[PDB]
Amino acid sequence: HALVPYAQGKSIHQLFEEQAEAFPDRVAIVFENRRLSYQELNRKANQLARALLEKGVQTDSIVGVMMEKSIENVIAILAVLKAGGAYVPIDIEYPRDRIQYILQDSQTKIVLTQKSVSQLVHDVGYSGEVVVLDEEQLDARETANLHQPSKPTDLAYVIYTSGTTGKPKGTMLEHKGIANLQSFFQNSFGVTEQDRIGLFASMSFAASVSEMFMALLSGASLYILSKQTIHDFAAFEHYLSENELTIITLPPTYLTHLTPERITSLRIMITAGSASSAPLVNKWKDKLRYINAYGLTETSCSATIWEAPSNQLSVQSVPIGKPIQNTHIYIVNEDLQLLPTGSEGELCIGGVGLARGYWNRPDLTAEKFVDNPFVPGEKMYRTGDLAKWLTDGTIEFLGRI
Ligand SMILES: Nc1ncnc2c1ncn2[C@@H]1O[C@H](COP(=O)(O)O)[C@@H](O)[C@H]1O
Numbered sequence: 001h002a003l004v005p006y007a008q009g010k011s012i013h014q015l016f017e018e019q020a021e022a023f024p025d026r027v028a029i030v031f032e033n034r035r036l037s038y039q040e041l042n043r044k045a046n047q048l049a050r051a052l053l054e055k056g057v058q059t060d061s062i063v064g065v066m067m068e069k070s071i072e073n074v075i076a077i078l079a080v081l082k083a084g085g086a087y088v089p090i091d092i093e094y095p096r097d098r099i100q101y102i103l104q105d106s107q108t109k110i111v112l113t114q115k116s117v118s119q120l121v122h123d124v125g126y127s128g129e130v131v132v133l134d135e136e137q138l139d140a141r142e143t144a145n146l147h148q149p150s151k152p153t154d155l156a157y158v159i160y161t162s163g164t165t166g167k168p169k170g171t172m173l174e175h176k177g178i179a180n181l182q183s184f185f186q187n188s189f190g191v192t193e194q195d196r197i198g199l200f201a202s203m204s205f206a207a208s209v210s211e212m213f214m215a216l217l218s219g220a221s222l223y224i225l226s227k228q229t230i231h232d233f234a235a236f237e238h239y240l241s242e243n244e245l246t247i248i249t250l251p252p253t254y255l256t257h258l259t260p261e262r263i264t265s266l267r268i269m270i271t272a273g274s275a276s277s278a279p280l281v282n283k284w285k286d287k288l289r290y291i292n293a294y295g296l297t298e299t300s301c302s303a304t305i306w307e308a309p310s311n312q313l314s315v316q317s318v319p320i321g322k323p324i325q326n327t328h329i330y331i332v333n334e335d336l337q338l339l340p341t342g343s344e345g346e347l348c349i350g351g352v353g354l355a356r357g358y359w360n361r362p363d364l365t366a367e368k369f370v371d372n373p374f375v376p377g378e379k380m381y382r383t384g385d386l387a388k389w390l391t392d393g394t395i396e397f398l399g400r401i
Pocket residue numbers: 161206271272273274275276292293294295296297298320383385397
């Protein structure tokens with residue numbers, strides 16, 4: 001039994017199926033002028049999951065996804081999880097050679113795409129199975145849940161990232177971190193089925209996975225923001241306002257361009273990926289609940305939060321806060337010795353959100369995902385981030401070691 005309760009023993013798609021059973025007629029997903037209910041979304045994913053099972057998708061199958069941000073991309077993701085596999089979202093705007101390297105590194109034998117992306121799949125020369133989902137004839141297939149065997153330690157998704165230099169690498173994420181996040185978001189952000197959540201991040205990026213499941217594992221609605229909507233700050237404000245969106249996660253670099261008087265309905269603004277200035281926090285923290293979230297691809301996108309304390313004077317600095325439920329974080333020196341208040345060292349993260357490691361990168365995995373000496377038999381991730389404890393028990397982010 002976990003320190004903080006969550007839906008232990010459950011896969012991502014099982015938690016989604018429970019929401020589709022409880023809230024069948026609520027709106028699940030919106031893109032432009034189209035929307036699906038939970039029941040509609042679940043049925044379509046089950047029809048596709050049975051097709052993918054017939055093609056050989058099984059536990060720890062890595063299934064490439066080369067698709068636009070769309071309702072059909074979400075159907076594909078849910079279908080891969082229900083068939084028992086794991087998906088790798090491939091950024092279709094990347095140069096050809098980067099897509100080629102990712103597909104080759106991943107060793108994926110099956111890629112899901114759409115008609116508008118088929119020519120790119122041909123041009124990067126992929127020689128495995130290609131499923132053109134908007135040519136697939138699925139309407140006759142059974143719409144019931146599959147109930148395939150699954151364990152929360154099974155792979156769910158693989159996210160590729162490239163450093164300044166270094167080859168793209170795949171971070172392997174299991175279901176368990178996203179199951180814990182469902183509990184975290186309900187407890188700490190009060191997410192309910194009433195919420196209307198924007199999908200901002202590229203569906204290549206680990207943050208997108210977090211955003212998508214923030215909605216779909218609570219019965220809330222997910223509004224997939226279009227390229228045009230994100231590109232124009234006025235259009236972005238109008239879209240949020242007209243659709244009464246209640247929660248969004250943004251890079252602070254984007255939030256900087258927005259006008260609080262132009263967003264009607266948000267109850268929470270989360271910023272992630274980089275630091276928010278104190279002036280940016282002061283501009284927003286009395287209009288809504290401002291949350292600074294610190295987390296990594298390697299930790300299921302989550303580690304710590306700092307919600308700006310409500311009804312307070314201005315702040316002159318912006319902590320990254322405290323570890324979230326069922327996660328551990330340590331500030332250590334180069335010898336992995338714990339540091340007292342005020343001493344800067346490396347953030348190391350442990351607990352349920354930790355990736356399995358890097359795909360086919362055993363020495364890098366061993367270097368980064370080290371034995372947790374504080375909790376025998378667990379691992380912890382060496383972030384490369386510098387931080388210190390404040391004596392109030394919050395963490396200050398200081399940059400890179
Ligand atoms: N709230 C934050 N404040 C400052 N840096 C952050 C924050 N959240 C994420 N980061 C940085 O982004 C990295 C994770 O990048 P990624 O895995 O691409 O999400 C972390 O190791 C930090 O360097």
